[PDB]
């Protein structure tokens with residue numbers, strides 16, 4: 853029926869903003885400073 857990749861690695865940090873995983877609490881930080889711009893779309897939590 854259906855099948856795909858399970859995810860051997862572990863992504864304890866995800867970026868819902870875009871949808872990418874990060875295996876580093878530090879790396880994600882620098883990345884978090886990317887979706888700052890106030891997109892034309894309404895937020896979700898502030």
Ligand SMILES: [Zn+2]
Nearest residue numbers: 867869870871
């Ligand atoms: Zn992101």
